[PDB]
Design an enzyme around this catalytic site. Structure first.
Site, PDB file in Angstrom:
ATOM      1  N   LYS A   5      -1.568  -7.522   6.530  1.00 50.01           N
ATOM      2  CA  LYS A   5      -0.313  -7.962   5.954  1.00 50.01           C
ATOM      3  C   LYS A   5      -0.090  -9.442   6.212  1.00 50.01           C
ATOM      4  O   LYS A   5      -0.241  -9.932   7.335  1.00 50.01           O
ATOM      5  CB  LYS A   5       0.858  -7.158   6.519  1.00 50.01           C
ATOM      6  CG  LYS A   5       1.824  -6.629   5.474  1.00 50.01           C
ATOM      7  CD  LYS A   5       1.281  -5.348   4.838  1.00 50.01           C
ATOM      8  CE  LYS A   5       2.387  -4.438   4.304  1.00 50.01           C
ATOM      9  NZ  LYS A   5       2.714  -3.337   5.254  1.00 50.01           N
ATOM     10  N   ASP A  11      16.327  -0.955  11.368  1.00 47.69           N
ATOM     11  CA  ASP A  11      16.035  -1.003   9.931  1.00 47.69           C
ATOM     12  C   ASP A  11      14.578  -0.740   9.535  1.00 47.69           C
ATOM     13  O   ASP A  11      14.197  -0.919   8.376  1.00 47.69           O
ATOM     14  CB  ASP A  11      16.546  -2.310   9.316  1.00 47.69           C
ATOM     15  CG  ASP A  11      18.024  -2.253   8.996  1.00 47.69           C
ATOM     16  OD1 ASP A  11      18.838  -2.502   9.910  1.00 47.69           O
ATOM     17  OD2 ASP A  11      18.370  -1.943   7.835  1.00 47.69           O
TER      18      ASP A  11
HETATM   19  N1  LIG Z   1      -2.289   2.039   2.031  1.00 52.67           N
HETATM   20  C1  LIG Z   1      -1.177   1.643   2.710  1.00 52.67           C
HETATM   21  N2  LIG Z   1      -0.063   1.280   2.034  1.00 52.67           N
HETATM   22  C2  LIG Z   1       1.043   0.882   2.712  1.00 52.67           C
HETATM   23  C3  LIG Z   1       1.021   0.858   4.099  1.00 52.67           C
HETATM   24  N3  LIG Z   1       2.229   0.432   4.518  1.00 52.67           N
HETATM   25  C4  LIG Z   1       2.982   0.207   3.422  1.00 52.67           C
HETATM   26  N4  LIG Z   1       2.258   0.474   2.326  1.00 52.67           N
HETATM   27  C5  LIG Z   1       2.775   0.353   0.961  1.00 52.67           C
HETATM   28  O1  LIG Z   1       2.846  -1.022   0.641  1.00 52.67           O
HETATM   29  C6  LIG Z   1       4.069  -1.328  -0.073  1.00 52.67           C
HETATM   30  C7  LIG Z   1       4.741  -2.507   0.593  1.00 52.67           C
HETATM   31  O2  LIG Z   1       4.477  -2.554   1.995  1.00 52.67           O
HETATM   32  P1  LIG Z   1       5.636  -2.903   3.037  1.00 52.67           P
HETATM   33  O3  LIG Z   1       6.693  -3.741   2.356  1.00 52.67           O
HETATM   34  O4  LIG Z   1       6.074  -1.642   3.750  1.00 52.67           O
HETATM   35  O5  LIG Z   1       4.858  -3.762   4.006  1.00 52.67           O
HETATM   36  C8  LIG Z   1       4.906  -0.048  -0.117  1.00 52.67           C
HETATM   37  O6  LIG Z   1       4.936   0.466  -1.445  1.00 52.67           O
HETATM   38  C9  LIG Z   1       4.182   0.942   0.801  1.00 52.67           C
HETATM   39  O7  LIG Z   1       4.141   2.268   0.312  1.00 52.67           O
HETATM   40  C10 LIG Z   1      -0.135   1.242   4.769  1.00 52.67           C
HETATM   41  O8  LIG Z   1      -0.192   1.239   6.028  1.00 52.67           O
HETATM   42  N5  LIG Z   1      -1.194   1.620   4.049  1.00 52.67           N
END
Ligand SMILES: Nc1nc2c(ncn2[C@@H]2O[C@H](COP(=O)(O)O)[C@@H](O)[C@H]2O)c(=O)[nH]1
Ligand SMILES: Nc1nc2c(ncn2[C@@H]2O[C@H](COP(=O)(O)O)[C@@H](O)[C@H]2O)c(=O)[nH]1
Ligand SMILES: Nc1nc2c(ncn2[C@@H]2O[C@H](COP(=O)(O)O)[C@@H](O)[C@H]2O)c(=O)[nH]1
Ligand SMILES: Nc1nc2c(ncn2[C@@H]2O[C@H](COP(=O)(O)O)[C@@H](O)[C@H]2O)c(=O)[nH]1
Lengths: 319, 305
Positions: A110, A238
């Site tokens: 990320k 949150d």
């Molecule tokens: N494959 C995968 N997708 C993720 C993971 N964490 C979040 N996402 C997806 O990535 C999108 C954005 O990530 P976030 O804003 O939570 O960092 C969300 O639609 C969520 O479902 C993860 O650990 N693995």
């Protein structure tokens, strides 16, 4: 055995190069009896200025910084990840889609803000101690590395986690749950996507339930309890519960159509790898796999209560 | 698990640097040919480690490799494997400026900025000549060239294949220019264990080297093309480093035994030779004309019977 660090973006090549670089240097660093306090303020930094050399995939000039490498090496170990595996996942081939996965879907990368990076330091000593005393058994994100890349004078911050989802089983539906009293739903924009990210009222409105069985439910709920209490102890609020759902039959069919195009084991997983996966109860309406993890702990109502509220909600998500 | 532990931080940086660059190069495809830019190229890395990995290494340092594709190609043209070169430098601290790696295979010489310039100057032609003679030559064999920045101090280093044997003890060495002047060992120099003698103390010793008229064929056929190449480059004032291993002496894994592919410069004493010896002979110190070329050549042809 040649690694080219080939990628769609120079940032990805530098990411691949730096994980590769730092993991190799770490291989020349004895594994310590314990972590010293400095290890938590430590970092490594390398600056490259090549001239007329090795410019096919890497830029000539870039920087790579690894925060607190001794600590993250240790976290990987306590999470049962081998450094060579980690390195191979990142460098054997370019991460793919700021949100990347390693080409093999084991690790998530990320892009975060500077503030996010600041909060990791704040929370890092305690998070480590908490990972120590819960033996790596936790629904919290599992942090494996933190990095700052610099390319064309631009700084990019990155945190590597273990994927909440399986590296092999498909997700057919996900939710971001918080338990907030506020209305939480998916925009008409979202619902239109392929894999929408549904929210609290979607979950409640669908009548959705997760049939895991009493023994899993209890183990799950005991994790959730100390996780959210730990988070409440810090100034953290949150965060979400990321819920992924895998339909075993739908997958079997999808696979079957996949081979058809060529011609023309079944809903199980390694709990040491797909660490947040839970099978459905033998008496579930249908054969499912779930992935459930706490999300977003880095970035009226106060913390202590959130953990209380968050907690009641997820306890009702299942049976 | 390499620690890069050494007597001195400069050496640690060197071990770390050769390690790093060789590993990096193993990710660089071997090209179909060198390009002109490869002769003006370099790698630079700067290290800044806060509270990390300081046991042997400085927290801050720089390491620059000059023309890494050209030197990698030179290594190959000399029959040196990158992995071995790396191993020789990093497995253990090079030892006693004039260092050799811990296994005496490679010599590490501190040199000057003007030196590093001069090398850039001759490098294309030196490489071309290494190609044209299939690696077979008494010239120094340049394996790499580096600049280290430690405690703010820049240090230049050139790596060569050791002229002497990595195993066979040398019992006496002569530096030979073929000059028409007074070159002898100084009273103080004449003192230590390993005396660096010169032309006069050699020609006034009646010392010959018995290799046969055959090895003298190979050797003199070699030496000529070499000093020629140096002339065309308008270089001179270089020596012939000569080493002598007295077999019987050392005796008091066999005597006079050695691997010609590793001890590239060594020559067996002839059958009819008086004492049983092994000689080591190569050109040294040429980083800097006709007369010197032809004069040099003759004074050397007069030690091989
Ligand atoms: N494959 C995968 N997708 C993720 C993971 N964490 C979040 N996402 C997806 O990535 C999108 C954005 O990530 P976030 O804003 O939570 O960092 C969300 O639609 C969520 O479902 C993860 O650990 N693995
Ligand atoms: N608590 C803490 N924060 C840090 C540390 N190093 C960097 N940060 C925070 O991380 C962010 C980026 O740091 P940078 O490494 O770009 O200097 C900044 O917000 C910075 O204040 C540290 O050692 N401790
Ligand atoms: N770059 C950097 N930032 C730090 C370090 N230590 C603390 N910080 C930053 O300092 C801030 C804490 O400042 P305070 O809010 O206590 O005045 C954090 O937001 C974090 O950004 C450090 O060692 N390096
Ligand atoms: N001719 C030539 N000289 C160089 C090259 N790179 C460095 N040098 C020379 O080698 C010496 C050391 O350079 P430095 O690497 O310390 O900047 C200086 O005299 C410098 O001009 C090059 O690519 N070509």
């Amino acid at each position: 055995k040649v690694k080219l660090f080939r990628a769609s973006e120079p940032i990805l090549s530098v990411l691949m190069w730096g994980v590769n670089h730092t993991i190799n240097e770490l291989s020349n660093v004895p594994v310590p009896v314990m972590l010293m306090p400095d290890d938590f303020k430590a970092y490594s930094k390398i600056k490259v200025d090549n001239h007329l050399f090795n410019k096919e995939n890497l830029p000539s000039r870039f920087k790579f910084k690894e925060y607190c490498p001794m600590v993250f090496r240790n976290l990987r170990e306590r999470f049962g990840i081998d450094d060579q595996d980690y390195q191979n996942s990142v460098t054997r081939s370019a991460p793919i889609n700021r949100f990347l996965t390693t080409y093999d879907r084991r690790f998530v990368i990320k892009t975060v803000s500077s503030e996010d990076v600041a909060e990791m330091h704040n929370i890092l000593k305690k998070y480590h101690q908490f990972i120590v005393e819960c033996h790596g058994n936790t629904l919290l994100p599992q942090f494996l590395g933190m990095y700052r890349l610099t390319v064309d004078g631009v700084e990019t911050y990155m945190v590597v986690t273990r994927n909440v989802f399986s590296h092999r089983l498909t997700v057919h539906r996900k939710y971001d749950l918080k338990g907030s009293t506020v209305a939480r739903e998916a925009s008409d924009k979202e619902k239109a996507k392929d894999l929408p990210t549904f929210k609290d009222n979607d979950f409640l409105n669908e009548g959705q339930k997760l049939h895991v069985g009493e023994e899993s439910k209890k183990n799950f709920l005991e994790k959730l309890k100390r996780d959210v209490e730990f988070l409440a102890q810090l100034k953290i609020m949150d965060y979400s519960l990321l819920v992924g759902i895998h339909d075993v039959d739908r997958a079997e069919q999808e696979e079957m159509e996949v081979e058809e195009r060529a011609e023309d084991g079944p809903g199980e997983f390694d709990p040491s790898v797909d660490v947040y996966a839970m099978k459905s109860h033998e008496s579930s309406p249908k054969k499912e796999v779930y992935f459930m993890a706490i999300a977003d702990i880095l970035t009226t109502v106060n913390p202590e209560q959130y953990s209380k509220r968050f907690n009641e909600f997820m306890s009702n998500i299942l049976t």
